[PDB]
Amino acid sequence: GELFVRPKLEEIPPADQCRGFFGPLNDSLKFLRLLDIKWMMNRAVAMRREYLIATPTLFTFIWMFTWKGAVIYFWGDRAPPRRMDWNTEETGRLPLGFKPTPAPL
Amino acid sequence: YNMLVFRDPKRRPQLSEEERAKVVVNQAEWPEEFKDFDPDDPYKNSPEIIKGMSSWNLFLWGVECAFIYQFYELVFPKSI
Amino acid sequence: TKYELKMQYFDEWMIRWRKFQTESDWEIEKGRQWWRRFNMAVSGALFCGLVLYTSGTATLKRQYGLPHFFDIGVDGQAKETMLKTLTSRWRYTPQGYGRVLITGVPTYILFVTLEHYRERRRMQQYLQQNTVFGEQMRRLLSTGKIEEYLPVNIKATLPASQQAIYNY
Amino acid sequence: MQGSWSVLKKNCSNFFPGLLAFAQQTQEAYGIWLRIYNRQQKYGPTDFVEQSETFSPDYHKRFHSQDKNMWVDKELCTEVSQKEVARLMTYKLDMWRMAHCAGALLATGGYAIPFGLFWLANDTWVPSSFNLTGEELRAWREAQDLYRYRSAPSYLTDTKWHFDFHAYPWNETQERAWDDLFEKNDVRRDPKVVRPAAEMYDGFIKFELIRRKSLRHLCRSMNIPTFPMLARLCNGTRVRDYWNLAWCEDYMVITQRLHESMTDEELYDYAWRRYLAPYDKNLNREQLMERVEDYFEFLGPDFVAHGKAPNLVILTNYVLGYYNDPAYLEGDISELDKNDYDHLASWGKDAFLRRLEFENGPLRDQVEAHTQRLLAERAAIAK
Amino acid sequence: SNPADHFRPNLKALTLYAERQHYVDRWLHVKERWLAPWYLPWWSPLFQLGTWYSQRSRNLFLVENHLSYRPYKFRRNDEDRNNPY
Amino acid sequence: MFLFFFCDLFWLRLLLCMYYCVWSRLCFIVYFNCLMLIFDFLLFCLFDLYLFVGLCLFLLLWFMLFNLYSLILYYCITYLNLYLLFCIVFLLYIAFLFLFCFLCDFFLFNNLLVGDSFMDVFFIRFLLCFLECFSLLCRCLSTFLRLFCNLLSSHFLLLMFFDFFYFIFVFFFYGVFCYWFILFIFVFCFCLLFYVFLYLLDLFAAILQLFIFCNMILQLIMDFLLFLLFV
Amino acid sequence: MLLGGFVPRRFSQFNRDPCWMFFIFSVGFWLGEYPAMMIKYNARDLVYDPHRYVWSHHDDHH
Amino acid sequence: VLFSTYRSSRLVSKEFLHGPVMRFRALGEYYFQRAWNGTLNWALPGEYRLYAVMIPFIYFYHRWHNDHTLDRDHVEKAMIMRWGGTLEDVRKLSAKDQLRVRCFTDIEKLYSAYGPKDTYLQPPGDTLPGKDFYR
Amino acid sequence: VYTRWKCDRLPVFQLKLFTQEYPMHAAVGIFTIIFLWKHMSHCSEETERKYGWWAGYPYWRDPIARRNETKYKQMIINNDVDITHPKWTGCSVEQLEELSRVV
Amino acid sequence: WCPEVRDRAELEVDITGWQWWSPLEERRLLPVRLRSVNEVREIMSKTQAKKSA
Ligand SMILES: CCCCCCCCCCCCCCCCCC(=O)OC[C@H](COP(=O)([O-])OCC(O)COP(=O)([O-])OC[C@@H](COC(=O)CCCCCCCCCCCCCCCCC)OC(=O)CCCCCCCCCCCCCCCCC)OC(=O)CCCCCCCCCCCCCCCCC
Ligand SMILES: CCCCCCCCCCCCCCCCCC(=O)OC[C@H](COP(=O)([O-])OCC(O)COP(=O)([O-])OC[C@@H](COC(=O)CCCCCCCCCCCCCCCCC)OC(=O)CCCCCCCCCCCCCCCCC)OC(=O)CCCCCCCCCCCCCCCCC
Ligand SMILES: CCCCCCCCCCCCCCCCCC(=O)OC[C@H](COP(=O)([O-])OCC(O)COP(=O)([O-])OC[C@@H](COC(=O)CCCCCCCCCCCCCCCCC)OC(=O)CCCCCCCCCCCCCCCCC)OC(=O)CCCCCCCCCCCCCCCCC
Ligand SMILES: CCCCCCCCCCCCCCCCCC(=O)OC[C@H](COP(=O)([O-])OCC(O)COP(=O)([O-])OC[C@@H](COC(=O)CCCCCCCCCCCCCCCCC)OC(=O)CCCCCCCCCCCCCCCCC)OC(=O)CCCCCCCCCCCCCCCCC
Ligand SMILES: CCCCCCCCCCCCCCCCCC(=O)OC[C@H](COP(=O)([O-])OCC(O)COP(=O)([O-])OC[C@@H](COC(=O)CCCCCCCCCCCCCCCCC)OC(=O)CCCCCCCCCCCCCCCCC)OC(=O)CCCCCCCCCCCCCCCCC
Ligand SMILES: CCCCCCCCCCCCCCCCCC(=O)OC[C@H](COP(=O)([O-])OCC[N+](C)(C)C)OC(=O)CCCCCCCCCCCCCCCCC
Ligand SMILES: CCCCCCCCCCCCCCCCCC(=O)OC[C@H](COP(=O)([O-])OCC[N+](C)(C)C)OC(=O)CCCCCCCCCCCCCCCCC
């Protein structure tokens, strides 16, 4: 809609103010910030870096709408059957008495 | 007037009533095609494209062509 | 030497006659897939390194400067270390076509060379195979033509329940 | 210019001597560029050296900023002379075209040979080194001028139309400047009158916001190869480098008044590299000096005072306006005595055409009066 | 049914049939003929563009190990749901 | 399988060649809004926002040469297939979407995250973003589905009504000479009224559906355009 | 766009322009083909095919 | 150098076939190049007579194609299936018999969904041949 | 003055139009064409019989069988295929002769 | 025989300037007209006063 101006370095709130799924991951819990997805989302919104949430989604949809959708439809592996036709590993080997041609030299 | 969805265009007046009243009409200068000109029937005196060819004659020509189209095979049938 | 032109016919034939694909040939193809992924990874790493090296000083300062998304403390230390390492010495920082060439040509050359020599490796592997696929590869390199229906000509092994067709 | 067999023979004969000359020029130009680059890195401003980032306000795409990413080295005369800078500029053009051709060769292997035959048959994209005599050089310059004529009007029209359709000048002086900027080369534009357009357009589109299509037109007009165009920040970099070198040379010349002592041919080349003086115009020294002085005046006092040139888009439009020839008009006025629709005369007029002629002809007033009177009578009778 | 039949192209002239194997092989022969000459090195972008993607796709097909059965693409009858053969 | 066939426009191509060997002004356009995107002066866009005009004009001409003339009996809409229309809309829509995505400006997608900071990010805003990203593709699908269905339904109805009219006209006109002539005349007048009404409705609907087809594409374009103000 | 052109006031004027002459001919064909179908397909001597129950499109499309 | 990229490279003289071309342009321009012939997106002209001429012509040639190329296939199928299942069997009939059969097919077409259903549904007790007549 | 639409010949203008005016649209169209001819260019014999014929499949002459017969005869004659080979029949030639004498 | 109009129109369309209306340029140029004699006298008087000053 309107033009977007990136926030200044002073306008970005501190990381300690961000909240996770249950509560802020302050000192003694900082390393849990990496694992909490909601905390990362809130931090991105706070820093005005909302694209980190939006860009991966849309692109993914496009990737599904364009390339993977048809790949799954045409070449995907359906559910296996109850009685399974496993490979006996007997096919392919040359028969006894066969004289294979020499390799290049 | 209209003929189905085709409406006859009408020229907008350009003269005011005062100026218009001072105009002297002399139909002797008009072409013979347009004398006693009527906006509701401007082509009443217009010449025919082909002398003696009426609109009903053309309509009947089409009707006869349709009858031929539907009845020729009844008189000269052909095998598959 | 151009191995791809020889190998395309062989790959198409194998797809058409994949029933006779032994587990050894399957392992060969899986190794080819793994090496393709490895080549992609190393080429991407080289491309990223070249991009980082040729990046502008202001660009690096913005990228590896404040603020910190997580602000754990290790993040800031790592960013400062990388920024100091890059900005300490002088770096050739081209723009436009020049950066395109510098970042891309080495990557393309590396990827293409690795893939080509892995294709040669796969050709050698199939040459050394003692299966019908290996025999087809050897015949292809000898006569220059793919001999279809070879597995049923030389009577390649079949499951015990499907040997009736060979009964002649 | 179109390809020809004579030019093909010329370029095939001079192919290897041309390559050798290009290699020698490459060594010399590398030396000159090394001097300039060392001086830029040592004495350049922090923003220029660090390559400060300037992003657009709408899509935040980086592009060169005229104020920050361009720097006029006022003291370059100590290390590099004016002639060396001109040599470097000419070599940059030749090297760009050669680089594109070499890239095509490497990409397509031996399948580029027939395209090379198309290439040597035209002087548009061959280096200047392929010409070993004066006449060959003259023909080559004619080809370059023809390409400039072909490309410049589109650039000028793009700029003018987009601005005029989406914006208008603020005051009368800006209106006059904008109108006089895009006059044909048959009339002389006063740089003092036209300068305010630079600020007016700075309000609209700075060089950092130049669109990719406009950039393509500009590079076509500057004899810069455009295929593959790629991102706009590649040919934009080429344009920035070329005009930065040009401004350094311009400062040197203005400060030292070299153009007055410059000889006729060298002066003509200096104007040509600024896209001010086509060779097909057969200009004399008076006209060349007038155009060069107008260019310096357009740069303005601030250029010497602080090394800041006017908006690059408007500057390019101004200089390329010399290649905006008047629209051609050939044929005697007597040709206007003929008729265009004689082939329809046999068809005559149908009923509707006759009605239109009758109602809208010299008797139109009488017909209108009669029709209105009849309609009024019918309306009165109806009521 | 009859109304539905009115929505078909009315100017069908000729139908040609060709097996995927046959024209794929012919295309491969053309590609080999044009990519064979010495003056087109294997490291050129043109050669890699011609060969690498095809090699990758064929390798992906060969590596495939699916627990389900994919019916033959060019069966005589693919309209019966209860008969993959 | 390779089927060789021809479109049903050859006579119209002949007429186009005959009547457009000389220039003519165009002043009536089905979708005029592609030419006027900006309504407030001093606003300008650095994006190529007028790139859609040529495709819009050609698409209108093509779809009009097919759909409008299909009202004539036995005229064939050669492209009337669901997946073919899907291909057409895919081309246009995905091409413009990829034009915006190749711009490599991620901030352009900031508006996808609906709402303000007050709303919970994971349980409200992110689900709205998911729905909006889904809605873009759904808009593409709905556009092509709407174009296909209108033509199919309109022409099915026309065919069925024409069949009924032929039946009653041919096999029950003798009632004009019978004592129940008034019933037949009433039915015949009703059929004529229905005939005219259906033709007018189809004529209006075809043009309106082309208008909406172009409007969807222009809406896709407009959703990502940003305008600067001249100073 | 239906802006203008010759417009006959009544039937008798259709013969004042070649294009409307062709139009009225076509209208004659259109309207006169229906009476012909009435006469042809409601004829006394028209007989249904004896083998009409041997085959029908209904069994074919089913 | 082999072929010009410019349209200005003429392949013929300016006066080549001038007369026929001028007659063709006269045919094109007389009715179309008029103020009241304002088109809607180049497809719908303003001149009434263009409609009056082109709608009948389009219908006529489309109908001829449909009657002689498209519906003929259905007619021939009905004739073959109802009278032997082979072309030779149909040709064993006379032209008059084929005319009767084809006109019955036309009857079925005109009834379609509103005619009597005894034209294709055999009532119980009917003595006419059934579906297994030729089997 | 120079304009692409007025000065260039039709093939040149076509290339320019789809390379510097609508390159993305051309790319997407080519992508879709490749997809269509890779996944929507096959029709089985049963599908042809069900839907491939205007008035229906003429079983009374079975044109598909004739088409396949011509195809296979042409392939056999041109490629010098021995259709009596054991792989095609599943039995030796002598067994084939024995079967011929039996039946 | 009016080459400037032709060239401008062709160039504008070729650079994607499809629109045929230019309200802003018209607004700039619409009230332009040759002056009356009295207006010329006033303008000459103004110029003479400026030169004298
Ligand atoms: C700029 C564009 C913007 C506009 C976009 C416009 C379009 C819209 C966008 C969306 C797209 C629309 C779709 C259009 C169609 C396009 C074509 C398409 O879709 O084809 C898909 C198509 C899908 O394949 P397919 O044909 O369906 O076949 C399926 C098979 O899987 C194929 O098998 P294969 O043999 O080909 O191999 C494929 C392989 C591809 O991958 C590989 O080959 C290997 C990896 C390659 C890496 C490439 C380099 C990356 C960078 C390297 C490092 C740099 C830094 C170095 C310095 C470090 C210092 C410390 O993938 C796999 O098989 C998966 C392997 C995964 C292994 C995971 C192992 C577990 C550990 C690692 C993960 C978990 C980590 C947890 C960490 C936790 C920490 C707390 O092709 C592929 O995806 C594969 C081929 C192409 C691979 C290209 C690789 C590079 C990709 C770009 C990376 C950089 C850019 C992204 C980041 C940007 C940030 C700013
Ligand atoms: C026959 C050959 C076939 C070739 C195939 C390969 C493709 C084509 C090759 C190249 C063709 C020629 C032209 C290419 C484009 C030219 C662009 C251009 O003009 O750039 C000018 C520009 C110069 O301008 P500059 O002013 O110097 O700098 C740009 C400004 O900063 C600009 O400033 P700004 O303000 O615009 O800043 C923004 C700028 C900032 O970026 C830059 O400009 C920096 C440079 C790019 C950095 C990209 C790396 C980012 C980090 C990646 C991290 C990945 C981690 C993954 C870890 C995985 C672990 C498991 O852009 C971005 O932010 C874009 C970031 C990229 C986003 C990617 C999103 C992809 C989404 C994927 C969707 C899903 C895909 C399918 C599914 C896959 C998975 C299953 O050039 C560059 O910056 C670098 C150009 C590099 C060109 C590409 C080199 C190609 C090498 C090919 C090697 C492989 C060959 C394989 C052959 C196979 C057999 C045939
Ligand atoms: C064998 C494998 C081949 C691989 C396949 C290649 C396929 C073809 C692609 C093109 C390849 C290049 C062709 C040769 C170009 C000539 C050399 C050059 O760079 O000229 C300078 C010139 C620089 O242009 P610029 O705009 O001034 O650059 C701005 C910079 O700021 C400029 O910086 P500055 O302003 O600070 O000034 C510096 C200037 C100052 O210097 C001077 O003033 C002196 C003159 C120096 C340049 C002289 C160039 C002469 C060109 C003509 C050569 C003679 C031709 C003879 C022909 C007839 C032969 C019989 O010096 C430079 O120009 C240096 C530029 C940076 C170096 C670029 C080279 C990097 C690649 C080479 C290393 C590769 C190592 C591999 C390691 C492998 C590891 C695994 O290059 C160009 O004109 C650009 C090329 C134009 C065509 C572009 C075509 C698309 C490219 C897409 C590539 C994407 C990645 C690759 C994959 C593609 C898959 C689709
Ligand atoms: C020994 C030498 C030294 C060593 C080598 C050195 C290196 C040399 C190489 C580098 C040279 C660079 C400079 C080159 C300049 C010249 C370029 C050029 O062509 O100029 C036009 C050149 C004339 O130039 P000019 O007269 O000087 O005018 C120049 C002006 O300045 C006018 O200029 P302009 O700007 O107006 O012209 C530009 C025009 C240039 O174009 C043209 O002018 C078109 C030329 C062709 C016109 C053809 C017309 C005739 C057609 C005939 C058709 C057949 C007729 C029937 C035949 C029956 C035979 C029995 O347009 C373009 O630039 C468009 C570029 C389009 C690029 C396309 C890119 C596609 C990319 C694909 C998408 C990828 C997306 C990414 C996907 C990624 C996926 C992972 O045109 C010609 O001479 C026409 C030649 C026609 C030949 C005959 C027809 C074709 C014969 C084909 C035979 C095939 C045999 C095999 C068949 C096998 C069947 C199985
Ligand atoms: C084996 C049996 C034979 C068949 C073999 C086929 C082989 C196939 C190989 C495999 C291909 C697989 C893929 C197939 C996909 C098909 C998809 C498809 O159809 O999509 C529908 C789609 C429908 O498009 P559309 O909307 O109808 O528009 C296309 C139209 O062509 C109209 O579009 P347009 O109007 O925009 O086109 C431009 C048009 C612009 O307008 C014009 O130029 C007007 C003329 C239009 C002609 C084209 C229309 C054709 C109308 C029907 C045929 C006309 C009568 C033919 C009579 C045949 C009698 C037996 O200009 C032209 O057409 C240029 C050519 C002009 C030729 C003029 C020749 C003059 C000769 C004068 C000689 C004088 C000699 C005097 C001697 C005196 C001695 C004393 O078709 C296409 O888009 C084209 C598909 C073509 C695919 C390539 C096929 C390969 C080439 C085959 C050539 C065979 C030549 C040998 C035949 C010999 C006789 C038996
Ligand atoms: C901008 C709006 C335009 C509106 C135009 C309105 C036109 C009004 C037409 C009035 C009736 C015309 C009757 C024609 C009769 C022809 C002969 C005949 O038998 O036809 C019967 C046919 C069919 O009648 P039917 O269905 O009763 O046929 C019976 C036949 N059997 C029994 C065998 C099935 O009539 C029509 O189909 C006419 C429908 C016309 C609908 C309007 C079409 C408008 C779009 C095309 C415009 C073309 C302009 C081209 C100009 C040049 C372009 C470059
Ligand atoms: C009666 C049944 C009815 C069913 C109806 C179902 C709906 C049918 C709708 C059809 C009409 C609408 C079609 C719209 C378009 C759909 C597009 C689509 O999904 O196609 C996907 C498909 C996917 O291709 P694919 O199917 O070949 O995938 C290969 C994947 N393996 C090998 C694992 C099987 O695209 C194509 O068909 C085109 C492929 C070639 C062009 C692209 C090449 C570049 C690829 C880049 C990435 C990989 C290489 C590395 C990078 C580049 C290096 C140079």
Swiss-Prot record, chain F:
Keyword match Glycoprotein: no
Any one of the GO CC terms: proton-transporting ATP synthase complex
GO BP annotations listed: ATP biosynthetic process; proton transmembrane transport
Localization terms from the record: Mitochondrion inner membrane
Transmembrane segments: 25-45, 46-66, 84-104, 118-138, 144-164, 178-201, 208-230
Keyword vocabulary terms for this entry: ATP synthesis, CF(0), Hydrogen ion transport, Ion transport, Membrane, Mitochondrion, Mitochondrion inner membrane, Transmembrane, Transmembrane helix, Transport
Predominant location category: mitochondrion
Membrane topology qualifier: Multi-pass membrane protein
Function, in words: Mitochondrial membrane ATP synthase (F(1)F(0) ATP synthase or Complex V) produces ATP from ADP in the presence of a proton gradient across the membrane which is generated by electron transport complexes of the respiratory chain. F-type ATPases consist of two structural domains, F(1) - containing the extramembraneous catalytic core and F(0) - containing the membrane proton channel, linked together by a central stalk and a peripheral stalk. During catalysis, ATP synthesis in the catalytic domain of F(1) is coupled via a rotary mechanism of the central stalk subunits to proton translocation.
Known partners and oligomeric status: F-type ATPases have 2 components, CF(1) - the catalytic core - and CF(0) - the membrane proton channel. CF(1) has five subunits: alpha(3), beta(3), gamma(1), delta(1), epsilon(1). CF(0) has three main subunits: a, b and c.
Family of the protein in this entry: Belongs to the ATPase A chain family.
Protein name as catalogued: ATP synthase subunit a
Organism of derivation: Trypanosoma brucei brucei
